[PDB]
Amino acid sequence: DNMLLVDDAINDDNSVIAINSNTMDKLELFRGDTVLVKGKKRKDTVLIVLIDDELEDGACRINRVVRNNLRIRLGDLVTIHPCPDIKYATRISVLPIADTIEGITGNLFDVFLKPYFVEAYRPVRKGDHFVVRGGMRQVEFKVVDVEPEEYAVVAQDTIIHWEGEPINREDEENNMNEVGYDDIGGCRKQMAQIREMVELPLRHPQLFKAIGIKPPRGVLMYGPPGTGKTLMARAVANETGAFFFLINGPEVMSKMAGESESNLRKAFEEAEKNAPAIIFIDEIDSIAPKRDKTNGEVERRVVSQLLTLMDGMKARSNVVVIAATNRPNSIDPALRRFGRFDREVDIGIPDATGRLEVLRIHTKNMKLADDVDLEALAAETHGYVGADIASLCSEAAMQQIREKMDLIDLDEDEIDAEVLDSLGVTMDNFRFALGNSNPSALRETVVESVNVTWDDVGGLDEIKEELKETVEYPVLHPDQYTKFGLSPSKGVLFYGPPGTGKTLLAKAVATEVSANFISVKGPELLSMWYGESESNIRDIFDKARAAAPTVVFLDELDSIASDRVVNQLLTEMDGMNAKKNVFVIGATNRPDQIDPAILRPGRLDQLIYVPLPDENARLSILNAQLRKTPLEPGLELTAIAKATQGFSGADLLYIVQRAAKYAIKDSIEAHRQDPVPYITKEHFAEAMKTAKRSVSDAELRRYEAYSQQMKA
Amino acid sequence: KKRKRVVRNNLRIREDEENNMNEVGYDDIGGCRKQMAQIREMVELPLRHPQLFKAIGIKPPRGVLMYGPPGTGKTLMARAVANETGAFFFLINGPEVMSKMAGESESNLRKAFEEAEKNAPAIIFIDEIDSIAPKRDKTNGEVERRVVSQLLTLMDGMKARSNVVVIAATNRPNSIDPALRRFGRFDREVDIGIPDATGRLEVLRIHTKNMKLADDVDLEALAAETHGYVGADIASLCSEAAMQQIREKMDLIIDAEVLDSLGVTMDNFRFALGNSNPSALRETVVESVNVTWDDVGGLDEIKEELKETVEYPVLHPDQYTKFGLSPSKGVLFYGPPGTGKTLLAKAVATEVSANFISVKGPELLSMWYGESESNIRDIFDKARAAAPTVVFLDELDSIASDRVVNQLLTEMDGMNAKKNVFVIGATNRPDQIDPAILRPGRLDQLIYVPLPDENARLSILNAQLRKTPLEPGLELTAIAKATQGFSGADLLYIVQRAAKYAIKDSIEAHRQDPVPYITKEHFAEAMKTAKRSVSDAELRRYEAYSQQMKA
Ligand SMILES: Nc1ncnc2c1ncn2[C@@H]1O[C@H](COP(=O)(O)OP(=O)(O)OP(=O)(O)O)[C@@H](O)[C@H]1O
Ligand SMILES: Nc1ncnc2c1ncn2[C@@H]1O[C@H](COP(=O)(O)OP(=O)(O)OP(=O)(O)O)[C@@H](O)[C@H]1O
Ligand SMILES: Nc1ncnc2c1ncn2[C@@H]1O[C@H](COP(=O)(O)OP(=O)(O)O)[C@@H](O)[C@H]1O
Ligand SMILES: Nc1ncnc2c1ncn2[C@@H]1O[C@H](COP(=O)(O)OP(=O)(O)O)[C@@H](O)[C@H]1O
């Protein structure tokens, strides 16, 4: 409980902290000594304590400037420690800030030397910002350097130096060197995993010695481009507070031979010198790509040198290596063996909550208009990684500038601040920017989370129970299976008429067990077969393993029934270990062309027939579609359900869509000539008159015959 | 020992001590008794007592070549033998020597060779020897043609009469320039495969000698459940289990009291296995099997025929030599699917205690299309190196061009008759099999595999259910009688369906051990929910084919 609550202070003094005597009693502090207050992200300061009985016990009084310097807000908890090693300063060097001296010239250092340090003995520390009043201005300077270390106190005999040039303020902010856990959202699981795999070796190495194990060193995080890998690495490095050193694949690969090895050796040696340290790499694929395609000697020697350096790392050393790559399988396989990068992590596209958090983080400095509905943007935007969200915000701001430019004239070199005061980003700007966006992650197989429950599934209760017994029990009750000795099956294959609710079933299954759904359509398999596609099935299954538990989906599996892809799929699936929580769900409308090998035990052996929806199922599905669209009061869907015998979910959805389109057209005409913003009976009448069936009766008979044949 | 409580520690019987990972004697290796013995024989004797070779008057062999799946401890094995013999050890990396400049690699090589020679009680251990001297037909570049030539010159120019032994390691045997296999070079071949259950148990004991294991440990169970795991995988599993234990204990967090409570339990090992993934099965490997003869049921005449075919020629080769008959090696099992052909092959291999090798249809197709890590040549070379062995070719009807068939025929013809290499072929479509493979001196013997009989079905049911609980008083004879016309696969499916029903009932009861076993009603429900997977047409076709063959 030594931590104390941060409180707003009316006083503007930069070297006085007022606390109650009971606050000293808690730590048994003695009057007349400075105290060290440490906040977050390795931010600390030393303040002269005063007794103010007015303040209630546990309440402090620190000006806003000190809190801003510490990077903390009101109401935070800061650790307070005594100052047994209080020391005075012998030589301090400080420089001014040019933007803070605007409007007044001259040398105010001499003006501030005496009045501000007249036997004050104000404790000082590296990087502190202190504000002094000169003439008609209040100028803030920074503590460039102080001796003796580490913080010391500003004694009168201390020699003060001011020989140098002013340094910008926002330059430090944009350095990117200061980013904590707060600057990331939507990666709670991956962030926690990285923290566990990094902090423990560095913060508490004694655990591994106590338990008798060599702590892991090789951590490899991979994900879609522009997903925040570098930002997450920087954030964790700063939060740890250990020494940092970064290597860029493009940078190292851009220098002639020899120089690359020299740089790598120097980096490793320097990191070893200043342990604990973290070594980070970027685009490790570029320096160590797949050997099967790059036969050049330069990359061979570079990768060999990297391997030798990794192997030669001493047994006991607080150094952790982190690598980044878009393709998990692109890097040379030699790096993935034990004693090297083995702790693999996959980062997927953020879900709705992740998108909301990212948008909140980015939209923290722009002049957001009064009417903003970030929740709606999060709901609409799917498949957007953080980088695309930042681009969307930038484009919306650009559109706002387009709208507001008419007031000003661009020829003049100055813009009136009155216009600047009016700048604001409205919802329409975000809508337009979203309309002019271009997501790219979704075009490739990427792991994403789904949140579909059994409610969305319109019926098929028996299939629901069968699927539950098949999947959920081994995922949440493996003890029973181990006790009985029965291994869990993994190969499930749905077959039936198209548009009967298969993908939604797979999503629901993935949601129930809280697993990362993976989608792989038949065209993707065909492209992989022809080689045009980048990722291969091996990559898909490696990502599935790294993201376990997972549910992989194979749509139109008959579209590849080609034999090489089938053979590779069989090999990868059989190689999978059953104990791992990995499941494959195949779908096909023609369960006859599939090669017999796929149906062997230990593979896609479970066969599930998907029948057409029943009247109750049709009614439930229609209700599910009609959740946001207002309906004519008294509208009855039972007649529609009864008149739609043999229909499929897709056909019912299209019926709803055409009815909505007719209602919209009627509204347009009425408005041109919104009193009627909903649908009425006539639209449904037209829709049902324009009804049909996507499946012929012959196909239904064939499906029934095949299902009965499989039963017998 | 090693040319060396406090006294014992000093004689080996602050980081500079532990980091110096040396003196790793025979104690720190398990599951490689045969290979360890071979390497010891080929290393210690030339070095320790070269006088013996002079006395017998013959030059000791020097060129050794080990190969095995990656991460099997080849480098560790070389280091251990070098430390045991007390001599100096040298290590070279193939990519490293290839990494350096064009002329720099040749320098490195010659300087290392001369430095070793001047001070040469020692072993020169090359690594990734394939990289420096890959298959000549594939790469013939300038540096590729230069470094290999320099290495060949150095090897052939070995001064002899010295105490230098050269050892090379490659994941695949037929992945180096063949010129290195001739006499006066790497000739003594050694194969290392995935260890058996005993080897994995030994590895686990070796690694788990410092970790604070919990009170209850069943390393025998871990060895039984872990199959196809290399030593590196075992070490990774142990590390993962320790990490899981640390994570579990991290929720309460340093005080020494908590550190004193650290303990690795069975749950941690189970979780680590759940998060493990061995990388050895996908490649063809050599192992051992222990399929007991009495394990299977029925087919007694087939058992006796196979015994006469395999055991007697190898058990009493003197009789065959005196008569002159050579051992039979071409056998082809044919019959309906799911009749346990692989089980019979494994049992036969266990009879002679040979190293069983398996090749599946997907591997055949991968080799056919050209995209595959290894070709039939590698499989046969490993079979020869690890002799005696029993190679199993599954789904010979899946190679329906003819390049793979021609290669297989050539390899089968090439091997010498005396060498103890046997081939067992399996196929459910005997018609498609190429007639050429049926010629004398090849896969000539045909063995029909009939479906199991009532007694065989009962034996199969009993064997499969030994490791599963059952209701006391249950009679499976009625089940066996009421399952005529089925196969082993159908019986296993019914058993697993009954187990699934028991699991469901137990889970529902716990939600609401009431039934830790399976009752008769469960079997009744399973059988009523399952039926034969083989039609009568297939049986009639098999009978007709058998009669035609008899004719
Ligand atoms: N939570 C977040 N997740 C992802 N990107 C984020 C997040 N918050 C901000 N960003 C923005 O994303 C970019 C940071 O990710 P970055 O572009 O470095 O990822 P990357 O593609 O993994 O990088 P690299 O260039 O190292 O391969 C910056 O634009 C940052 O503003
Ligand atoms: N008897 C053993 N067999 C296999 N591995 C073992 C054995 N004893 C220990 N190990 C562990 O397995 C690994 C074997 O050594 P190492 O990691 O060098 O693999 P390797 O197969 O020799 O490597 P490479 O072939 O790539 O040079 C090490 O982790 C070693 O600790
Ligand atoms: N139980 C259900 N049966 C059929 N369709 C359903 C069911 N529940 C919902 N639907 C609807 O079916 C439509 C088609 O879903 P989709 O996954 O494309 O089907 P498919 O996988 O058969 O092509 C979706 O709009 C979905 O809302
Ligand atoms: N005597 C036996 N005859 C037939 N099958 C058996 C026998 N003993 C065990 N089995 C079962 O046969 C199964 C092997 O099936 P499968 O691999 O299809 O046979 P094969 O590959 O030899 O055609 C094993 O799971 C095993 O439980």
UniProtKB/Swiss-Prot annotation, chain B:
Catalytic activity annotation: ATP + H2O = ADP + phosphate + H(+)
Glycyl lysine isopeptide (Lys-Gly) (interchain with G-Cter in ubiquitin), cross-linked positions: 118, 135, 159, 329, 346, 467
Phosphoserine PTM sites in chain numbering: 279, 326, 535
Positions that bind ATP 2: 338-343
Biological process according to GO: ATP metabolic process; autophagosome maturation; cytoplasm protein quality control by the ubiquitin-proteasome system; DNA replication termination; endoplasmic reticulum membrane fusion; endosome to plasma membrane protein transport; ERAD pathway; macroautophagy
Pfam families xref list: AAA, AAA_lid_3, CDC48_2, CDC48_N
Superkingdom, taxonomy of origin: Eukaryota
Effect of residue 395 to D: Moderate reduction in growth rate
Residues reported to bind ATP 1: 70-76, 171, 207
Keyword check for Plastid: no
EC number(s) stated in the UniProt entry for this protein: 3.6.4.6
Effect listed in the UniProt record for changing residue 182 to A: No effect on growth rate. Restores cell growth
GO terms for MF: ATP binding; ATP hydrolysis activity; identical protein binding; polyubiquitin modification-dependent protein binding; protein phosphatase regulator activity; ubiquitin binding
Subunit: Component of the heterotrimeric CDC48-NPL4-UFD1 ATPase complex. The CDC48-NPL4-UFD1 ATPase complex interacts with the HRD1 ubiquitin ligase complex composed of the E3 ligase HRD1, its cofactors HRD3, USA1 and DER1, substrate recruiting factor YOS9 and CDC48-binding protein UBX2. Interaction between the complexes is mediated by interaction between CDC48-NPL4-UFD1 complex member CDC48 and HRD1 complex member UBX2. Forms a complex composed of CDC48, NPL4, UFD1, UFD2 and SHP1.
Misc: Present with 78400 molecules/cell in log phase SD medium.
Protein name: Cell division control protein 48
Organism this protein belongs to: Saccharomyces cerevisiae (strain ATCC 204508 / S288c) (Baker's yeast)
Gene: CDC48
